[PDB]
Amino acid sequence: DGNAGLLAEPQIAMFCGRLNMHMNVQNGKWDSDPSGTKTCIDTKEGILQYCQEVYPELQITNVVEANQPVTIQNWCKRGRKQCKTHPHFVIPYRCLVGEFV
Numbered sequence: 001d002g003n004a005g006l007l008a009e010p011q012i013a014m015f016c017g018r019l020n021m022h023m024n025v026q027n028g029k030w031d032s033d034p035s036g037t038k039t040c041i042d043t044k045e046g047i048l049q050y051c052q053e054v055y056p057e058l059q060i061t062n063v064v065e066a067n068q069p070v071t072i073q074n075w076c077k078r079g080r081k082q083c084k085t086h087p088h089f090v091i092p093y094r095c096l097v098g099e100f101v
């Protein structure tokens, strides 16, 4: 079973020119890049590394594209500032937790 007390699954969302977003599993909201500097990544390995960076304690071992597109409002385009605009939608990547054997 999963944790009902956590509104969402770990995921990252990218849109080149803007800061990467990730899902806050506690509240179900998209949070901006923790360092406030990282934008889109073009390799699967780079995405996995990023999942591991923003979810350091989740033991993320793989990533896969999500099935549904998602809209994110007022996306952060730099710093952790300058982020009030029209909606954009992207297909997120799910950060998958492996079961270690």
Ligand SMILES: [Cu+2]
Residues within 6 Å of the ligand: 086, 087, 088
């Ligand atoms: Cu736009």
